[PDB]
Symmetry: D2
Subunit: 292 residues, 4 copies
């Protein structure tokens, strides 16, 4: 459902830039085998920006089909226009997905009242659970704790993916919401720290290529075994950093390809192929994690 | 026309959020009479995020129809997916627009090489002049002078709307491009400074309500009469700042309503109505400018 | 020694701006009674910048005398010139102080190698334990974890006061140093979070006026009772923030005066008296903490 | 003289870190012959942080003695304690200096009112012209245009060395002060831009090694010949940047040694010797400038 190691799964492509079913199946089977808790389909790492709404929906539905009830699937459903986010969410109503990951509007920099109205309107047009997603480095907007508090009062707003990397937010939000509101890290390099402070899991980029380690790290964290979890964290720390050596998901797609998890590392413009230097950096990080 | 005072025009809406032809007509007449150089249609200030492609195109064509050859129209054509930007541009080829204003991809944070490929691909598939648009505070990425220099070698790429407010960019770019490449400010509060450093004009929010003063300011600047231009700028400075007291174009639409230029100040979610405190601040700024 | 609630004690003054012995005695007795773990004398909150070296030394020695072995005393000994920091430290050698709090050089923005050489040289000219102090908002310099690691190899460099407010630093530093290196927060508003992550205590501004609450919060933290500690934290959160409503130690001196702990709230220029609005804000924070 | 190219001169040292009279003489002769407007003695670049008051005064008096009336000398007189700044200023009254350069207090982060009181008190107790110095990246505080406007009403406060690199400050300050208040850049890389916007000169690091080119650049700027000035600036731009590749004045002292202007590149801790990579970068910048 909404705890533990949740993968922000890549949308693997063929050389033409369209979804590769065989690759997607291999990834999903990998996550089932590895103990991943849930899959976020067509979030940021899944190239939401460069799929059209139909393509996006096809990937989500394919991912649900391939998961075949073995692993819960959360759909990316954000938009910077409220009407468009409502449309997208409505596509998944009564679909099998367990909830939605919905990003603060990007580019148009709404106020906190705007963010409140946007997410409230979206929640009102679905029965699905909603996970808010805050990532100001990408959006130009910052969904502050006070506003998360106001939104957490809406019945089906049930958690947040907090991708600021600002660890003070964990307890700021926790004090304004009920004990069942879920706090998930959106920042792999700080996620263990984030769980140590009270968070419930991570929506992870690193879990694409280190799924078993991430699941084990998160289990240990949930049980309060921080020192054991840190050892795993330290082995993964170069990936947590170097998967952003070039823009996400350029490095993680290459890593998936190098590990034999996907057929090609193709992306859509304006994402471009990994540089030679980037390959060498990511390769070293994979070697450090024991994956290669 | 790509120099002087260029208005980033509001998209006036009725109470249902649909484009108000009558209000738009009144704005376009105002710009023609007030000496505005050109109209940017469905830019940021025109709520490009919350119009769908069809609506966006309708507004541009309506603007061209109402302008009736009396003022040049530049279309907002940016996207964060290169295929989508190409597609949107094709809809305007042979429309009568004089050029396009194309923003760096937002949210996905491409590399400089990605930006280069993005804009090169867009330019390749049109004969329309392209004006690059850099606004890191909205997009999460920053198109740097080195990359602007690379792109300025593309025949069709003719200028940049530089909205960082970082005035060192003027001469960093100027020294890498030819004399005929246009440097336009996208930051009203620093625009006169930008012109004094060698910029050619401004793509302006303030121009929506102070069109004549903007046009005269930019002419005086182009002639080197900076002290005279500065007097105008000082009367407009509160508006340059307070049109962003709440997210653009919330204040400017309320200002246009208050002057009588549009029938309603309605916006689309996630933009929300101006607060009372914002009305007060904006009205005071209009009065400082001598407009009310 | 170097754990729990450590007060960054004010240097109380008379109306002429010189140390008030009676006030200092009242504070010290308060900290003994309250369970404060140690006193940092003439740190930042003690107005190190505006005492001359003789005055600084007189305050430290007076504080040691008044403490009368009841509470350990750590001297502020930082300087932005290495020779000057060595001179100051040498004043306290064989004095009774238990260690030194030594800030990264300010203003001159040395490199990390510079910071390494500065602190190594200082440590070499004393047998006293050294606590490094990182506060980039004040110094223009940031002592990174890697360099803290290099310094922690020097026998008498034994801990750090980490005043970035960046909670990721706790585990970054912890992984590079031995298990006996002390990690203390320098940021009251994040300090409980900092202890939750592995830190050992706080050098606190808030402890000047909430000494018993701070000591109890830190004891609960050390014992792993985070939820009980948070309740205390929440009552103190407005002070942790509002003691910086005007520049430290302007608010905390006023609060000390209002509580009857010191005779006057006088400071030395360029610190200036608290504003009326500041008094009202700090008063409300004191009322929230139950102290007034 | 408070206009044109003003050098922030190095304090040349022998291998023991004491001032080298012979090297200083050679620098002063160089500045006299190269048309530098004035010499700032024991500013930032002159290692004011690591000289004691007596040494600082000795260097200023030695500079005046060697200058022998042939070039004006401005003393660095700032401090972070207002009494200390007053005291240091008194040592120079009737010395033959033409003015003082006085930095905003560093480390203690005073309010704007504190800055106002600080500088007003210093100005009150001298008849020497005072030049305010704003450099937030070093001090932790930012003297804002509104406060500069307040201080410019003090008879003795005659200008500002604005080292933010934020070029919007030029005209924000200019509009609040009289026509005779001097605006000087303290950021070599943006200095020509600063002059083009209405600044009167530059207090320069680059001028230590490119005195003639700096002097001609600033004259051309003062005459309005910006394109001609820009040609010079483009040859100096790598030096403007690479003199800060390691902390100032590490690079510039090594550059002066490499040109033969000083006998040693020695600095005081916490400044440390230039790295090999830094030598390479700086030498390349000197060659681009045509100096080697
Ligand atoms: N590329 C546009 C539309 C994406 C459609 C959602 N899959 C944006 O990021 O909003
Ligand atoms: N709302 C989406 C699609 C808008 C279509 C362009 N008018 C975005 O900002 O990319
Ligand atoms: N005010 C100067 C000297 C202070 C002397 C130390 N108590 C500085 O902050 O370095
Ligand atoms: N090193 C101390 C005192 C220097 C005295 C002035 N030359 C500071 O930067 O304030
Ligand atoms: K809820
Ligand atoms: K071109
Ligand atoms: K040690
Ligand atoms: K004056």
């Amino acid at each position: 459902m909404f705890t533990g190691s949740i993968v922000a799964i890549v949308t693997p492509m063929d050389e033409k830039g369209n979804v590769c079913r065989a690759s997607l199946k291999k990834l999903i089977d990998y996550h089932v085998a590895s103990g991943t808790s849930a899959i976020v389909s067509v979030g940021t790492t899944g190239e939401f920006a460069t799929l059209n709404h139909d393509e996006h929906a096809d990937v989500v539905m394919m991912t649900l089909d391939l998961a075949d009830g073995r692993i819960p699937v959360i759909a990316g459903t954000g938009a910077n226009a409220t009407a468009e986010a409502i449309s997208l969410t409505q596509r998944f109503n009564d679909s099998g997905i367990v909830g939605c990951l919905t990003v603060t509007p990007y580019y148009n920099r709404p106020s906190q009242e705007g963010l409140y109205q946007h997410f409230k309107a979206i929640a009102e047009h679905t029965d699905l659970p909603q996970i808010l997603y805050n990532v100001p480095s990408r959006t130009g907007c910052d969904l502050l704790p006070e506003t998360v508090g106001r939104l957490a009062k809406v019945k089906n707003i049930i958690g947040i993916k907090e991708a600021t990397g600002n660890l003070t937010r964990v307890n700021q939000i926790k004090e304004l919401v009920s004990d069942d509101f879920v706090l998930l890290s959106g920042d792999d390099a700080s996620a263990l720290d984030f769980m140590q402070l009270g968070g419930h899991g991570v929506i992870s980029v690193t879990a694409n290529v280190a799924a078993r380690d991430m699941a084990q790290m998160c289990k240990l964290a949930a049980e309060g075994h921080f020192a054991e979890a840190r050892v795993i964290n330290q082995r993964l720390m170069p990936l947590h950093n170097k998967l952003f050596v070039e823009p996400n998901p350029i490095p993680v797609k290459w890593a998936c390809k190098e590990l034999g998890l996907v057929a090609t590392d193709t992306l859509r413009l304006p994402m471009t192929p990994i540089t030679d230097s980037g390959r060498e950096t990511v390769r070293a990080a994979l070697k450090h994690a024991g994956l290669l």
